[PDB]
Ligand binder design. Structure first.
Ligand SMILES: C[C@@H]1NC(C)(C)CO[C@@]1(O)c1cccc(Cl)c1
Ligand SMILES: *[C@@H]1O[C@H](CO)[C@@H](O)[C@H](O)[C@H]1NC(C)=O
Length: 536
């Protein structure tokens, strides 16, 4: 009713999906997206919920079921800590836009302002990009991009965005320092999306936007970037791979039916994503028709697409100020909820792992939030959109795909998928069934390993709209990705080193659950008997 409704919608759903869908064509992004959501996203969501709910442990410490894999929990915690660096900058932007949308005549409509350049063009009077009043506001008035030569020269933070990020981090801390623990913040995004869909589809030229959306081109599906984008967006929206589902479900009741939650969340995700893309392309069609430019080159396909679209739509509704205020309140509340969820994943994992941390949640919360603030200072610089692009590309990229692949492999092969299904039948009365066992053991790891190998061997040098990141920027992005990814083999080669006993003793102790470590002394384990692995 409300739980799955608010739960489903996320900032990653109304901010990242729009420009990922624009950049990857129109509906050509919804075929890979839906494919993964059906095959490798819904089973992974259900698996994460079941894991967290049965084991009662956070992202990091849920690996008492197969010790060698605690590195996977550490990797997901690191991925979350990374994403939290640039996920607070989006909320800083939302806060700045809510602050600047409190005037009658909004700023992003005309360009007789002070941040406008002598190149601006107002449609109410051939790189049409970044010359429209709203694009010049976002770039020149908020980010101050015009003061950064690139990712090599990023000036000092913008005191406006500095204050906004500071307030956001203060809100996060003060809402996250006491324990882990309304309906309007879960109903609003859907209502704003409904208003946008209706009005947009009423807009002139939105017919061309909807046609470009519905016109599926397959030469683009044949490429490797659309599938990587779809997979990363599915794991970025539904949560599988951030240690957030496990941490949140550990507090769910035991008899809680996580299968219902998985089904409803996937359904709502698919539906709302189709609708959001529909509305976004209606707004793109209107922008392209009013600005006299093609739909494929009317706006930025980067991290600031929605901050140019949604002002463009706001400014075409009656009483557009009320709409600006309400839409940016919605965006800010969604951002705060999602960032609090990610920070809670991190804190709950690292506290469930280290009791010394769980004793002091004030100090640990302060540490985590102060770290995220100091590291977002980089993204809120004058060339901070470049660092934000770097992080968005590499923070949760092949890193998240690899983490989720290793988690699925662990649970489905080393901990057994028949064992997992027996746990399910224990906490829910019904066995998951053939479809889910098959998507956990074979189909999900297959798809995810293919997408990982592709994202590695089909990686396109990082670039902003018309800016080619220098080579070392890609080097640093891959350093980030690997730092996130290299924790699994490190922790395995560690476990195998800090367990006294024969080679097979050490390969069992790290592969058996932590409670049934008295069954290993006999040299009798399931993983060793070569029948476990035939558990389809
Ligand atoms: C973007 C993510 N979408 C989820 C649904 C998985 C909820 O968590 C997130 O909001 C998140 C994850 C990790 C760190 C941070 Cl700061 C935020
Ligand atoms: C647009 O930009 C140029 C250089 O970027 C600047 O001299 C002026 O504002 C405009 N010039 C032309 C030819 O449009």
């Amino acid at each position: 009713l409300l739980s799955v409704v608010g739960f489903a919608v996320d900032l990653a759903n109304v901010w990242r999906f729009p420009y990922l869908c624009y950049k990857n064509g129109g509906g050509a992004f919804l075929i890979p997206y839906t494919l993964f959501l059906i095959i490798a996203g819904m089973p992974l969501f259900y698996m994460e919920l079941a894991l967290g709910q049965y084991n009662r442990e956070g992202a990091a410490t849920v690996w008492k079921i197969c010790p060698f894999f605690k590195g996977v929990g550490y990797a997901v915690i690191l991925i979350a800590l990374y994403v939290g660096f640039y996920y607070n900058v989006i909320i800083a932007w939302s806060l700045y836009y809510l602050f600047s949308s409190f005037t009658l005549n909004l700023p992003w409509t005309d360009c007789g302002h002070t941040w406008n350049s002598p190149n601006c063009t107002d449609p109410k009077l051939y790189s049409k990009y970044k010359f429209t009043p709203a694009a010049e506001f976002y770039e020149r008035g908020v980010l101050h991009l015009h003061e950064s030569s690139g990712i090599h020269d990023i000036g000092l933070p913008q005191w406006q965005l500095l204050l906004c990020l500071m307030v956001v981090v203060i809100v996060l801390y003060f809402s996250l320092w006491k324990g882990v623990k309304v309906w309007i913040t879960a109903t609003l995004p859907y209502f704003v999306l409904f208003v946008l869909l209706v009005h947009g589809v009423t807009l002139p030229g939105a017919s061309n936007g909807i046609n470009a959306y519905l016109h599926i081109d397959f030469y683009r599906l044949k490429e490797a970037t659309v599938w990587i984008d779809a997979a990363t967006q599915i794991f970025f929206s539904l949560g599988a791979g951030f240690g957030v589902l496990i941490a949140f479900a550990s507090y769910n009741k035991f008899d809680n039916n996580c299968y219902r939650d998985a089904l409803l969340t996937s359904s709502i995700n698919c539906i709302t994503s189709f609708v959001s893309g529909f509305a976004i392309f209606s707004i793109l069609g209107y922008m392209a028709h009013e600005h006299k430019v093609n739909i494929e080159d009317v706006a930025t396909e980067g991290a600031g697409l929605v901050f140019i679209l949604y002002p463009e739509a706001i400014s075409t509704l009656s009483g557009s100020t009320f709409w600006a205020v309400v839409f940016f309140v919605m965006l800010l509340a969604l951002g705060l909820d999602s960032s609090m969820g990610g920070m809670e994943a991190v804190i709950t994992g690292l506290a469930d792992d280290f009791q010394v941390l769980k004793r002091h949640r004030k100090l640990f919360t302060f540490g985590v939030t102060f770290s995220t603030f100091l590291l977002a200072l980089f993204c809120i610089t004058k060339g901070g959109i470049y660092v934000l692009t770097l992080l968005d590309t590499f923070a949760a990229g092949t890193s998240i795909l690899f983490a989720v692949l290793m988690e699925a492999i662990g649970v489905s092969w080393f901990y057994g998928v028949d064992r997992f299904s027996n746990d399910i039948q224990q906490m829910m009365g019904f066995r998951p069934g053939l479809y889910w066992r098959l998507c956990w053991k074979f189909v999900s790891p297959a798809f995810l390993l293919f997408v990982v190998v592709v994202s590695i061997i089909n990686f396109k040098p990082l670039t902003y709209d018309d800016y080619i990141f220098p080579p070392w920027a890609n080097w640093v992005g891959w350093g980030i990705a690997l730092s996130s990814m290299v924790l699994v083999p490190i922790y395995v080669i560690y476990k195998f080193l800090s367990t006294q006993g024969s080679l097979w003793e050490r390969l069992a102790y790290g592969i058996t659950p932590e409670n049934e470590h008295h069954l290993v002394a006999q040299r009798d384990i399931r993983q060793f008997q070569l029948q476990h692995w035939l558990a389809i």
